[PDB]
Design a protein around this ligand. Structure first.
Ligand SMILES: O=C1N[C@@H](Cc2ccccc2)C(=O)Nc2ccccc21
Ligand SMILES: O=C1N[C@@H](Cc2ccccc2)C(=O)Nc2ccccc21
Ligand SMILES: O=C(O)CCC(=O)C(=O)O
Ligand SMILES: O=C(O)CCC(=O)C(=O)O
Ligand code: NI
Ligand code: NI
Lengths: 288, 288
């Protein structure tokens, strides 16, 4: 069985989305530079350590899906300068997203999260994303273009023994799910900064951590059309932080109005025919 | 040809959604009381008068669909006490919406707008709503439950001669649109406070104003699943106004996290497993 296609972020940029469209998955080598990975890790480190279990009793929106050996930290903009500046303005991410979502219109971040898997974390069951937040997605026609995609960025090494992600190639086009098995999977072996890109229909899972010593970390960036509601809110992010961002980054975090691809688009999150950014007089690129 | 079913808001409450489900439209008699209509009208009056044309050059999100003899005013919460208190907490609206959207989960306001049609306003072309903002909706399977519904509330009399809404009964189930004609329509004749309820698949249009003297006004409330992005933003609504609302009204305006109907729902607009309202310490029902 054939492996996940590997593509250069520098050279093969126009080939990335067509590849995912065909196979359901692609590995983007050096999606983030090692410098960006280093700064991202440093900035999120303490927030990963203080994060409780996903289904902690203190939470009013507990995650009952993820294992107790998973830690997930979202709403990264206020935590990480590298995220809000480098990741949110990634030329590669934006080319892929505009290739992917042009049929629908504008796109934004549905969730940007760091996930850290403790030693001996078991494999996740094979799944498609979005089913515990957006039931609407299951009612889309089979040939509907993907309404969200997920960049699974390695922040530490992904190996077969430490739980590298499994994917079933071609499974984004499957309607009958009788042949879903771990026998049908291939692995996303990745160095830090490489990204596995999948769609919301790609059948995949986190792998089993089998060493008992290694901690695997990733940055998962679910990008989706602006017509779908994000899993996370940036409503509580301080205005100085928001005003430090580019207009594009502001749009990605829901601090701007949005547009569909309809020829006479009437817009999303508008205020009596005017945008959020015009109405609130929202500055951009103001240093902290 | 049969007329639009007419139902009591007081007596026939459980019958309303089943009726719309079957026929694509229903008239809810006295959906709003005359007192609520009176206060709503008084409060929005000046904002309708100052509103420019829908496609005004001053706007960065112009509406190129609506006629120059239409005035549309949305983001009503800061304008109208009657809207934000009485309309947003309507027992009838909430029963219908929970009946309609239980398969998907939470719902909210996609747009609440007052529309005023000037004398001699021409008929709109026959259409389905949501096509100039949510291209995603066209990619839903034919049997997918409606993801949004529209309450067209009469704020002045709707008559045949002054442009009462046209609907094609049963058209919410149509896939082939070859028989779409004004010959297939019936009218929503309504007194102020009556509401025409349709789905996002019901083929309908505003009627022709033929008197040359009468100004027709309506309150259009598009309610939709919380998984779809609103056409309008309440991000710029002052915090004192938001904190005056009920928790339910806050949720409807995007000032709360949201839930899907998935058995192990992980939530929408959450902040590291906690809700917007918990994180921002958002008060509710604090008088101005
Ligand atoms: O919690 C998340 N569940 C997944 C689904 C899933 C996870 C584990 C096992 C089975 C299913 C999801 O739908 N979305 C995301 C996306 C980014 C990070 C976490 C999740
Ligand atoms: O501008 C709006 N266009 C309509 C569609 C339409 C209107 C006129 C003529 C043809 C199509 C819509 O999709 N949504 C709404 C909903 C509430 C108020 C206005 C509109
Ligand atoms: O652990 C991984 O590599 C995959 C994680 C994943 O698919 C998820 O949490 O949704
Ligand atoms: O004018 C009416 O009664 C219908 C208005 C309408 O359908 C719309 O503007 O979307
Ligand atoms: Ni997943
Ligand atoms: Ni309409």
């Amino acid at each position: 069985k054939s492996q996940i296609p590997r593509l250069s972020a520098i050279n093969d940029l126009h080939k990335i989305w067509p590849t995912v469209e065909e196979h359901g998955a692609a590995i983007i080598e050096s999606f983030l530079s090692l410098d960006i990975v280093r700064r991202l890790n440093e900035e999120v480190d303490p927030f990963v350590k203080i994060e409780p279990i996903p289904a902690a009793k203190t939470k009013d929106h507990p995650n009952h899906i993820l294992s107790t050996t998973t830690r997930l930290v979202n709403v990264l903009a206020p935590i990480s300068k590298a995220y809000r500046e480098d990741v949110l303005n990634s030329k590669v991410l934006h080319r892929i997203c505009s290739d992917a979502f042009h049929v629908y219109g504008d796109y934004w971040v549905l969730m940007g999260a760091v996930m850290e898997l403790a030693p001996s974390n078991p494999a996740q069951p094979l799944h498609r994303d979005m089913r515990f937040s957006h039931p609407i997605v299951e009612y889309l026609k089979p040939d509907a273009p993907a309404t969200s995609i997920n960049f699974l960025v390695a922040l530490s090494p992904f190996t077969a023994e430490n739980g590298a992600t499994h994917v079933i190639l071609g499974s984004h086009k499957w309607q009958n799910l009788s042949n879903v098995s771990m026998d049908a999977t291939v692995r996303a072996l990745m160095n830090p900064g490489d990204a596995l890109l999948i769609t919301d229909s790609t059948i995949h899972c986190g792998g089993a951590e089998t060493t008992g010593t290694e901690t695997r970390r990733l940055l998962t960036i679910t990008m989706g059309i602006s017509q779908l509601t994000p899993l996370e809110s940036n409503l509580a992010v301080p205005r100085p932080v928001i005003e430090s961002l580019t207009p594009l980054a502001q749009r990605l975090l829901g601090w701007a109005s949005q547009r569909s691809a309809a020829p006479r688009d009437i817009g999303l999150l508008t205020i009596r025919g005017n945008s959020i950014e015009k109405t609130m007089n929202l500055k951009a690129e103001q240093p902290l």
